[PDB]
């Protein structure tokens, strides 16, 4: 897998599990980022789009990492550091995986794409 | 700022048609497609070879596709805003 | 500078007529399509 | 894959110089800059107005700046991989 990434603001899509168990977002800045009502848009090849929505109030602190686990991973939901996507078993697998971070007003602010 | 402008600059353009770009109405879109600009990325291409220059791009849209001042202004603004966010 | 006096719009209809694979005719593509029209006509 | 290729396709290009584009050596880069293609985005723009076409882009690159088969192959492949990810 070849990796491609774009970060417009404070939060980057740092790591994408090729086995689909998680997505990790990192606040690469020295400031706290409000991420309330933000969304993760996951596009695996030609599969239907996967949308994960963040709670209506959520803060990713300066330099911190938040992992969003798919239900299949058997992770424990511990809100600040770890979020469990209960209704979805996988982030998805395939040869092309595109994970985008969308802000509260519908703008793509970050992305990581895994190819081959 | 318009709905078409907001929706265009919010995300990567990918495979979007010329009409998705702000200022590109039905007439202006039909003429750009007639010139071979089926997709909005083909218009971005012209904007990029014209080195993001406003005067050169708006005079180009006017000369080749009959764009009025409001149309050329809106198309350039959307592409400039998009290139700053995604390029 | 072999197909001069021909507008970009007439060069396009000529690319279409000769089934020459092409994109739009703009300042940075003009010379290349004129060369393709020349290569076509001269065969 | 070279280091130049890997660095180019991993992130947005912005206003990076032409030489950052894989396949673009000293001579090639110099020849492009004198033709107005001083930034990699101007060359991406050319690739887009040519509808991302391999034959058309490689032929333009050979005719404009004297690029060889390996150079045009690498410049095309880098722009194609980049546009598939970020456009």
Numbering used by the authors:
A (entry chain B): 430 to 545
B (entry chain E), D (entry chain D): 3 to 89
C (entry chain G): 2 to 44
Provide passages from the article that reported this PDB entry.
Interestingly, missense mutations (P22L, T43I) and a small deletion (ΔK37) associated with exclusive cardiac defects were detected in emerin LEM-domain that interacts with the DNA binding protein BAF. By contrast, Thr43 mutation was located on the opposite side of the LEM-domain, far from the interface with BAF. Only a few signals corresponding to the residues close to the site of mutation are shifted, demonstrating that the mutations P22L and T43I do not modify the 3D structure of the emerin construct EmN. We succeeded in solving the 3D structure of the complex containing EmN T43I at a resolution of 2.3 Å. The structure of the mutated LEM-domain bound to the BAF dimer is displayed on Figure 3c. Analysis of the crystal structure of EmN T43I bound to BAF corroborated that this mutation does not perturb the interface with BAF.
It consists of 254 amino acids including an N-terminal LEM-domain, a large intrinsically disordered region (IDR) and a short transmembrane segment. The emerin LEM-domain binds to the highly conserved DNA-binding protein barrier-to-autointegration factor (BAF, also known as Banf1). Finally, BAF is able to mediate interaction between emerin and the lamin A/C tail.
